[PDB]
Ligand binder design. Structure first.
Ligand SMILES: Nc1ncnc2c1ncn2[C@@H]1O[C@H](COP(=O)(O)OS(=O)(=O)O)[C@H]2OP(=O)(O)O[C@H]21
Ligand SMILES: Nc1ncnc2c1ncn2[C@H]1C[C@H](O)[C@@H](COP(=O)(O)OP(=O)(O)O)O1
Ligand SMILES: Nc1ncnc2c1ncn2[C@H]1C[C@H](O)[C@@H](COP(=O)(O)OP(=O)(O)O)O1
Lengths: 159, 176
């Protein structure tokens, strides 16, 4: 189907949006799968460390896996901070060269909100240049954010 | 009902041919599936790997992890790679066992002489001439599976018979 490439600060709402989006798609009979730290970091990317080079390879491998899911006809949602513009652009081009729909989705809450949420007590990021969608997770709720994504997918005939 | 059907065998043994026919059968019977092969893996995810023993180890490790994701997503994932090393195929199986996902090792078994006689891509001739170095079966090893779930004797069974053998295994193991 396509790749829905989430990006945004820690605590902005990527895990939450991806879970609710997958729920909506599954209940509407649309095949979908999420790539996230829980299924990538200790599997495909277990042999990558902290160096810039390895982080670049981390994103490249995630993008190539999302591309296979998209080619297979799934909505593939990636849920990573994805901080660097160059790496997001590389992920985009991996898809665009194969004519696979790619949606860069900026999960956008202010740092202050993310810090106040501190969902995991964890408490630089390059904001998306021209993403296909911005989800303002401080001003609307999870269901409205999901609906914005679904609308985007309908317009491009994925849903 | 996701799972991985892991093909292994010499160049020209019939992996591409079996995977295509099996995918077509499954699609036509309403069973989601997807094939991982050289065409969608070795110039994408694995574009930064060659054919040295260590790069084959990594090729197969990465493919195993991706196949686990597809099986986890509920697809029948068919992998079509020589996968010549026992240790690496066993690791691929362990990755699936670790995630409670069924894994079926299918040995696509044709004698080397048959594969050389088929010489589908002219590679065996080049290998013998030393024009390609490290070609599996000529100048690098193929370790035959000793406990595969299924052996497809592609020199004595036709493609449709081989596909039906795989479908039967999937039925026995409650996948389809
Ligand atoms: N030296 C070497 N040895 C074996 N096959 C090679 C080699 N050079 C290239 N090819 C071509 O690549 C394919 C094997 O790649 P795999 O990813 O299946 O190999 S492994 O699982 O990593 O061992 C073969 O399929 P083909 O189209 O018949 O040509 C062959
Ligand atoms: N519209 C919205 N979308 C997503 N999450 C929201 C939201 N409004 C409030 N939240 C909350 C739910 C979670 O407690 C928190 C986001 O946590 P998360 O999804 O785990 O973040 P991330 O995966 O981006 O690190 O913010
Ligand atoms: N039972 C069988 N299964 C698969 N291929 C068979 C077969 N009987 C004959 N063939 C032929 C079809 C092809 O020309 C050749 C196998 O080529 P292939 O599928 O490209 O091999 P591989 O992908 O293992 O390198 O053998």
């Amino acid at each position: 189907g396509c790749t829905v490439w989430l990006t945004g600060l820690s605590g902005a709402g990527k895990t939450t949006v991806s879970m609710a989006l997958e729920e909506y798609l599954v209940c509407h009979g649309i095949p979908c799968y999420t790539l996230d730290g829980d299924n990538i970091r200790q599997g495909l990317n277990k042999n990558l460390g902290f160096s810039p080079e390895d982080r670049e390879e981390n994103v490249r491998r995630i993008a190539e896996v999302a591309k296979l899911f998209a080619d297979a006809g799934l909505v593939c949602i990636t849920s990573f901070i994805s901080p660097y513009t160059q790496d997001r652009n590389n992920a985009r081009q991996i898809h665009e060269g194969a004519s696979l729909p790619f949606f860069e989705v900026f999960v956008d809450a202010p740092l202050h909100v993310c810090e106040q949420r501190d969902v995991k007590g964890l408490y630089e990021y390059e904001k998306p240049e021209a993403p296909e969608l911005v989800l303002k997770t401080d001003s609307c709720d999870v269901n409205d954010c999901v609906q914005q994504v679904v609308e985007l997918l309908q317009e491009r005939d994925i849903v």
